[PDB]
Design a protein around this ligand. Structure first.
Ligand SMILES: O=C1CCCC(O)=C1C(=O)c1nc(Cl)c(Cl)c(NCc2ccc(Cl)cc2)c1Cl
Ligand SMILES: O=C1CCCC(O)=C1C(=O)c1nc(Cl)c(Cl)c(NCc2ccc(Cl)cc2)c1Cl
Ligand SMILES: [Co+2]
Ligand SMILES: [Co+2]
Lengths: 381, 381
């Protein structure tokens, strides 16, 4: 059931912003590891004395990496005279965030019709304001409200190229890497208590619960009207034999925050071949593959969607497969992106639900919790 | 003149330690950019609840990348019960260093006969103590004194594998990259005042001035007995037309610190081909090449050391060449390693002074200051 209750007009995911200690090194690592091109910058070379910000793009996916300079470079500025291109940025907030949480997502940014209206309606409906609407060069409006922990939901609206004051990167510095990633599918938060987190976010957005369908967690998914903005949230389940990985996250992250970004690929086999080639030469590692038990049982579950060749190809690459009543989900998880066992990435591809493809086709992998387990009965095999 | 006045027995450079916000992303970037292998780790997976530390090696060169975890993970420990593998590490010092200076070198580590003696003799001769000698698993002794700014000179001595509590990285995670880099040749500091810095360091080490031979700086080089540990120091020259790049460093770094690491290659042409291939796909950028004027004048200066083919090969790769009275220096500089215009890397190869090659053969490039200038008379050509 989709009541289409959005309290303001939401379009799509726009960008994800990581707060870093050194934006250059994280951005270069991510560019090589994920096959994203350097597309825009805002830094000393563009007159920004406040923060260094580098944008990576792959298809529609935009990753922004930002770090503070010495405050001394901008100590004479005030907000009316700032050279920062992102006016919500604050040196102290960014250093506090990074020392508390380590490398991670500060902003989940969605494009909206009118960022000033979205902010006003959000706060009127319970959103905790984080940064008020500011109009950038009479062209772009940006506003921020708290989402969970120290993560903000960022509204961006365009009258009519990333943000004013960002410069397009020169082609010599912009190598056209591409491993097939095309857009952000969903962004997932970990919280101590799911109920209060859902009531808060659904309260100020009007996002509705996206329907799903005893290891670690309870979750629920909030969705915009066309279900293209998807925001799952997890809480830990305590008292289990194996300690909840949500609780481990909360401990190492110093509380709630963004757990994973799921990135849609136009060809998950090519994406995984390319990413795995680079795992040990600067890119990303992947979680341990499920046993061949798992793939020996995939024929009985998705043998009508994937050929015998394509399922064995899944086993080469360690890809997981799940199915709901509308479509099929191919998915795989990286190891944590940084020092702490906190944020990681999911690569996904969805098949089915063609009308364009409707959002969330195939779900989020809930059936794989039982199936992985089942599959680990190989120790008795 | 080499008075061989070392106040304690010094062997060679041992490692360089970077203090980072996220050690994983810097280490992976550096590994790919410089062709260094992941060789050892100390982190949560090895029981270290305090800091994440990753070691990269190429030949004899050792780069260590360290970042703090949340203090909460280790809040119950005391120094007698610490799980840190580097006992000098302190969360507050590391966060303070990184917020002040950005990504950069915290420790220049040299191997000595007896780290406890080196510490005691150093401090008896004016060294400011930073971390007292500590014996690690009755096998390794480590001690630290202040060098300049917040950089420490670290003494390491071995009774008889990097440090106790570090684990060798599994071969699957350890790809054998190698672009030809083999050892640290010299490590250079920038200070506001050269005189007091030299008197201090030469005062507690007994290092002697290594002989050299109006753009930016004055410098001098301190050297151990066999001149294999080489520590140049620069100060700005004020009142010039072009602002001193040493002063720019001091401003962006929030004071004195390490300016560059010079890494010896066994084949600088191969190293530069390999590094430049990767500049735009996650590796390192290089400073702008000198004009073809410069290479059109290299035949008259080093045409007896490099063939016409090898000099044109220098012009392809942007390599600089200098010569003193003992040998020839091939050198090239990266752009800054991180967000701030502070630390960068030099790649070098030295030819001559064979007896083994004596240290500092060919100097440090002082003649290239005049020659670059001269060469930029092409705007009138
Ligand atoms: O869990 C949910 C519920 C909310 C919706 C959502 O999108 C997801 C997933 O995407 C998902 N689904 C599956 Cl089936 C598994 Cl097994 C997952 N975690 C494995 C994993 C654990 C730790 C590390 Cl460090 C890396 C990987 C994840 Cl995170
Ligand atoms: O200067 C000294 C004197 C002390 C001994 C020493 O080892 C060096 C050099 O190695 C050196 N020699 C030369 Cl000839 C040049 Cl032009 C240099 N700087 C260019 C450069 C400037 C800014 C950035 Cl960001 C990158 C590069 C350097 Cl740093
Ligand atoms: Co997911
Ligand atoms: Co040098």
């Amino acid at each position: 059931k989709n009541p289409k209750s959005d309290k303001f007009k939401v379009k799509r995911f726009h960008h994800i912003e990581f707060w870093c200690g050194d934006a250059t090194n994280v951005a270069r690592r991510f560019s090589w590891g994920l096959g994203m091109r350097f597309s825009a910058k805002s830094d000393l070379s563009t007159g920004n004395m406040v923060h260094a910000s580098y944008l990576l793009t792959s298809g529609d996916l935009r990753f922004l990496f930002t770090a503070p300079y010495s405050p001394s470079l901008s100590a004479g500025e005030i907000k009316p005279t700032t050279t920062a291109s992102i006016p919500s940025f604050d040196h102290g907030s960014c250093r506090s965030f990074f020392s508390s949480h380590g490398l991670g997502v500060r902003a989940v940014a969605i494009e909206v019709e009118d960022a000033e209206s979205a902010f006003s309606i959000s706060v009127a409906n319970g959103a905790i304001p984080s940064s008020p609407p500011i109009v950038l060069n009479e062209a772009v409006t940006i506003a921020e409200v708290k989402l969970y922990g120290d993560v903000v939901l960022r509204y961006v609206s365009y009258k009519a190229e990333f943000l004013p004051g960002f410069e397009r990167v020169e082609d010599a510095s912009s190598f056209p890497l591409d491993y097939g990633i095309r857009r952000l599918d969903h962004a997932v938060g970990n919280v101590p208590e799911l109920g209060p987190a859902l009531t808060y976010v659904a309260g100020f957005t009007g996002f509705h619960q996206f329907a799903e369908f005893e290891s670690g967690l309870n979750s629920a998914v909030l969705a915009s009207n066309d279900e293209m903005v998807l925001l799952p949230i997890n809480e830990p389940v305590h008292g289990t034999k194996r300690k909840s990985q949500i609780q481990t996250y909360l401990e190492h992250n110093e509380g709630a925050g963004l757990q994973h970004l799921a990135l849609m690929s136009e060809d998950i086999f090519r994406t995984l071949r390319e990413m795995r080639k680079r795992s040990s030469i600067g890119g990303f590692d992947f979680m341990p593959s499920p046993p061949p038990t798992y793939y020996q049982n995939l024929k009985k579950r998705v043998g009508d969607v994937l050929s015998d060749d394509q399922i064995k190809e899944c086993e080469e690459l360690g890809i997981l497969v799940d199915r709901d009543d509308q479509g099929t989900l191919l998915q795989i998880f990286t190891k944590p992106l940084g020092d702490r066992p906190t944020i990681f990435i999911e690569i996904i591809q969805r098949v089915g639900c063609m009308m364009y493809q409707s959002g969330g086709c195939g779900g989020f992998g809930k059936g794989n919790f039982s199936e992985l387990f089942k599959s680990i009965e190989e120790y008795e095999k």
